[PDB]
Amino acid sequence: VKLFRASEPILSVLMWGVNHTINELSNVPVPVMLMPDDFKAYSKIKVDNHLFNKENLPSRFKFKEYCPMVFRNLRERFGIDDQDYQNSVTRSAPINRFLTTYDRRFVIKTVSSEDVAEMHNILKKYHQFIVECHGNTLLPQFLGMYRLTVDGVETYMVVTRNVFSHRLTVHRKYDLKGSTVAREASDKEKAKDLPTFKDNDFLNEGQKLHVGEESKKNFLEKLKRDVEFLAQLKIMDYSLLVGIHDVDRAEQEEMEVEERAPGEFDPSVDVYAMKSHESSPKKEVYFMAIIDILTPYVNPEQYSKRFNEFMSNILT
Amino acid sequence: VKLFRASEPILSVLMWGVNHTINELSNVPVPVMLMPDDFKAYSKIKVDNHLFNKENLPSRFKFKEYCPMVFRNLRERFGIDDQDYQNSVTRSAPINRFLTTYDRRFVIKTVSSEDVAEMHNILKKYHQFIVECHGNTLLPQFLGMYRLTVDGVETYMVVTRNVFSHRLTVHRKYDLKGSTVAREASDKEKAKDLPTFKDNDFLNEGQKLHVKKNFLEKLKRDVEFLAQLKIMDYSLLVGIHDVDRAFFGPGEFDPSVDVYAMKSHESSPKKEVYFMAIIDILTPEQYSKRFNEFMSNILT
Numbered sequence: 001v002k003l004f005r006a007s008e009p010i011l012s013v014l015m016w017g018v019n020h021t022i023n024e025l026s027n028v029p030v031p032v033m034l035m036p037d038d039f040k041a042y043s044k045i046k047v048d049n050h051l052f053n054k055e056n057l058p059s060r061f062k063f064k065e066y067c068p069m070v071f072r073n074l075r076e077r078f079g080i081d082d083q084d085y086q087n088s089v090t091r092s093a094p095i096n097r098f099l100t101t102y103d104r105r106f107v108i109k110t111v112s113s114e115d116v117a118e119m120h121n122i123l124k125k126y127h128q129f130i131v132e133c134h135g136n137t138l139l140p141q142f143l144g145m146y147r148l149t150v151d152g153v154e155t156y157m158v159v160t161r162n163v164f165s166h167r168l169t170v171h172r173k174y175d176l177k178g179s180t181v182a183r184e185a186s187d188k189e190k191a192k193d194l195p196t197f198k199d200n201d202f203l204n205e206g207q208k209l210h211v212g213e214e215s216k217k218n219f220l221e222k223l224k225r226d227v228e229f230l231a232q233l234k235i236m237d238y239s240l241l242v243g244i245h246d247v248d249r250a251e252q253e254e255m256e257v258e259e260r261a262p263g264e265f266d267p268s269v270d271v272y273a274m275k276s277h278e279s280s281p282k283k284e285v286y287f288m289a290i291i292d293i294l295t296p297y298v299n300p301e302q303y304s305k306r307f308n309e310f311m312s313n314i315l316t
Numbered sequence: 317v318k319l320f321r322a323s324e325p326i327l328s329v330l331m332w333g334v335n336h337t338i339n340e341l342s343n344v345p346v347p348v349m350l351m352p353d354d355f356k357a358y359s360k361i362k363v364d365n366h367l368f369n370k371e372n373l374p375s376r377f378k379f380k381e382y383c384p385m386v387f388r389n390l391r392e393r394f395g396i397d398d399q400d401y402q403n404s405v406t407r408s409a410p411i412n413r414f415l416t417t418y419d420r421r422f423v424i425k426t427v428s429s430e431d432v433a434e435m436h437n438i439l440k441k442y443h444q445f446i447v448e449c450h451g452n453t454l455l456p457q458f459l460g461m462y463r464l465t466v467d468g469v470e471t472y473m474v475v476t477r478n479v480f481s482h483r484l485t486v487h488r489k490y491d492l493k494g495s496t497v498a499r500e501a502s503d504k505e506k507a508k509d510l511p512t513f514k515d516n517d518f519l520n521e522g523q524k525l526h527v528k529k530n531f532l533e534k535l536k537r538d539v540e541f542l543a544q545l546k547i548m549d550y551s552l553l554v555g556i557h558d559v560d561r562a563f564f565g566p567g568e569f570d571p572s573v574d575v576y577a578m579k580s581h582e583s584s585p586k587k588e589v590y591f592m593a594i595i596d597i598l599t600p601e602q603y604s605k606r607f608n609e610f611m612s613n614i615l616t
């Protein structure tokens with residue numbers, strides 16, 4: 001029984017819309033393959049109620065889902081049950097433009113019309129890329145894309161698997177581009193609780209991530225083919241997001257919250273999570289992934305190059 | 317998996333619509349009471365798919381459900397569970413403007429705009445009457461009313477519980493009206509697979525119905541209410557099934573499902589089951605009197 005209650009009517013329409021589209025997909029059979037028309041398909045519903053069911057939803061609103069058969073196939077290829085996707089968005093309102101599902105599993109980013117067009121233009125090759133690498137990739141893992149209409153204004157939304165763990169807390173984070181230019185977290189930004197540090201906050205701090213050999217080799221191979229993919233698509237401005245989870249600090253914080261009365265993770269769920277080296281000073285867990293992927297076009301050849309040159313020795 | 321495969325796309329839309337609106341309703345709490353606005357309310361959905369989910373549904377269509385809280389409450393007062401109603405419409409395409417759900421539990425009637433207007437004009441009083449009589453009535457039991465827009469034309473339909481049994485075959489049907497003019501089955505209608513006899517052929521046949529008293533108690537109350545609301549042109553539908561024609565057994569029926577069925581007396585000549593209920597009440601005080609008199613002289 002789903003009230004769709006949310007801080008804001010637009011979140012309520014989000015919950016309702018994911019519930020509706022997933023339920024409808026339940027009655028659509030799963031095809032042997034995708035056809036080209038699935039990559040320009042869409043489904044739109046326009047709801048005009050009157051004196052009915054307006055406790056939480058607005059009376060009037062629209063919901064459009066893009067290429068639903070494609071994003072369903074992707075969900076499956078990323079190992080995500082449709083039932084679990086629906087439950088994550090609809091059992092309780094997403095929270096704080098960026099949202100997370102209440103269980104911290106998925107990220108919903110508000111984007112623009114141009115981002116949606118870029119997704120359309122790259123979706124066929126992105127789907128082929130996912131299929132050939134079996135979902136093993138640092139790239140964003142796209143799960144759905146929608147357009148809401150609340151009070152006659154459109155809002156585009158992209159759903160991704162969270163880069164960070166859904167259960168391990170991130171204690172520091174960086175956004176890295178390897179741009180030749182200095183990107184530093186502003187003193188205001190660097191005054192947040194969890195500031196988003198940029199490249200030279202990472203440099204001036206002496207940060208190093210130690211994962212040893214096998215995980216390092218996997219990460220560098222993924223990184224090479226991912227950013228070659230982006231560059232071949234003439235895509236720019238993507239960043240590497242890194243979150244540090246301090247295992248010891250978490251253990252202390254949990255003991256402190258319990259006083260008011262493992263260090264492990266599942267890699268089939270936290271698919272960007274890596275453990276610290278065995279001979280490593282502080283038991284740490286790292287979440288590392290490429291983000292901000294829908295901006296086309298100095299040369300993307302050059303951005304690819306500088307990016308990978310920076311990230312290759314982020315860790316050693 | 318509810319495919320919505322039907323004989324015509326309007327039936328697919330009907331199926332889809334009932335499915336949709338009932339699921340939505342499962343997410344709407346059931347109130348402690350209905351409110352005035354519940355009798356002025358509707359839900360509207362417009363669907364515009366492109367290259368998607370098009371095997372059995374159309375890609376553009378609209379569905380409108382009138383007063384969904386009132387009709388859900390009515391469903392409850394008539395002892396009909398929402399998932400069973402939904403399964404009777406959506407599990408298989410309705411059949412043959414009058415339709416029947418695949419299981420014959422419910423009939424679906426195409427209707428005019430005028431009659432939708434009339435239903436809105438009577439609905440609060442009708443709901444109150446259903447409350448007071450505890451559902452014990454011969455009136456049509458209204459379970460849902462919808463407008464469907466398919467390929468640009470609107471189609472209004474009203475859903476009722478079947479007057480006839482959903483399993484026992486009917487062997488003779490009569491549409492009694494008690495008029496002071498004479499109605500009779502057309503010679504053309506007389507050559508149908510199951511004629512619809514009207515008033516004069518019951519008299520000129522000699523059919524009587526045998527048993528007991530509480531049925532006239534029900535009928536007079538119903539038709540008094542109809543007249544008090546200035547309604548005319550209703551009929552008493554009567555259907556007769558003969559056991560002897562012919563797992564399950566002869567004359568066997570569930571009174572909770574076939575709510576109008578009634579067994580013949582032991583002093584009946586032939587073993588029969590009757591189904592009798594008032595129908596077509598969407599549109600005077602003399603009509604009540606003549607209708608009731610004629611219905612009076614048909615029991616033994």
Ligand SMILES: O=c1[nH]cnc2c1ncn2[C@@H]1O[C@H](COP(=O)(O)OP(=O)(O)OP(=O)(O)O)[C@@H](O)[C@H]1O
Nearest residue numbers: 039040041064113114115116117118120121147154
């Ligand atoms: O299938 C596609 N292949 C390529 N590109 C597409 C496709 N589908 C959408 N795009 C683009 O991605 C933005 C969508 O935005 P939208 O279409 O939801 O907005 P509408 O056009 O409906 O205008 P409206 O009357 O509702 O105000 C616009 O750049 C639109 O061209």
Ligand SMILES: O=c1[nH]cnc2c1ncn2[C@@H]1O[C@H](COP(=O)(O)OP(=O)(O)O)[C@@H](O)[C@H]1O
Nearest residue numbers: 098107161162163164174175196239241291292
């Ligand atoms: O998956 C995520 N989990 C947690 N935070 C994220 C995630 N993705 C993005 N973010 C946060 O949003 C910031 C901006 O990301 P992104 O570059 O995609 O948005 P942008 O277009 O505003 O620059 C990230 O650097 C990070 O602070």
Ligand SMILES: O=c1[nH]cnc2c1ncn2[C@@H]1O[C@H](COP(=O)(O)OP(=O)(O)O)[C@@H](O)[C@H]1O
Nearest residue numbers: 414423477478479480489491512551553595596
């Ligand atoms: O519940 C039903 N089950 C089976 N047939 C019905 C039922 N209700 C009505 N009918 C059939 O359709 C005919 C038309 O009924 P109704 O009086 O409601 O339409 P009308 O507006 O043309 O007079 C009935 O006389 C009977 O033949």
